[PDB]
Design a protein around this ligand. Sequence first.
Ligand SMILES: CC(=O)N[C@@H]1[C@@H](O)[C@H](O)[C@@H](CO)O[C@@H]1O
Ligand SMILES: [Cl-]
Ligand SMILES: [Cl-]
Ligand SMILES: [Cl-]
Ligand SMILES: [Cl-]
Ligand code: NA
Length: 129
Amino acid sequence: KVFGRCELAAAMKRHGLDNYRGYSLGNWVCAAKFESNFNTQATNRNTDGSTDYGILQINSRWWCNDGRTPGSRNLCNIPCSALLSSDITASVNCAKKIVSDGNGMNAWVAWRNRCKGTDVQAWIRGCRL
Ligand SMILES: CC(=O)N[C@@H]1[C@@H](O)[C@H](O)[C@@H](CO)O[C@@H]1O
Ligand SMILES: [Cl-]
Ligand SMILES: [Cl-]
Ligand SMILES: [Cl-]
Ligand SMILES: [Cl-]
Ligand code: NA
């Protein structure tokens, strides 16, 4: 599923991402924009053999199991395919654990390089949130 901008912000708010760990809703929408272009089916292979999955491009090296990342962890206790569904519950729950482990939203390369220090509020502007 390819979310609309305001559609994704509502779903992120309903699951409790707004101001989670201090990051306003515009940060999460901006991150999803530049990580997956709002596509829940997005995948990308990293050079070390791991794969990023879903709306927030969650890495199989630590957070999910895909059966083909030797020596990796499954800290969110889910199959990586669960991160590709049209329901973003699995992605949001796993993102809450990722963003809680000390480094905040810097675990998302696209957020650090393309959202951090910008007007992230613009990504939820006009939305009937
Ligand atoms: C939180 C998370 O898993 N972020 C990933 C990161 O692992 C990886 O370096 C990158 C590769 O494109 O995409 C995402 O930022
Ligand atoms: Cl915001
Ligand atoms: Cl594996
Ligand atoms: Cl949803
Ligand atoms: Cl932080
Ligand atoms: Na894994």
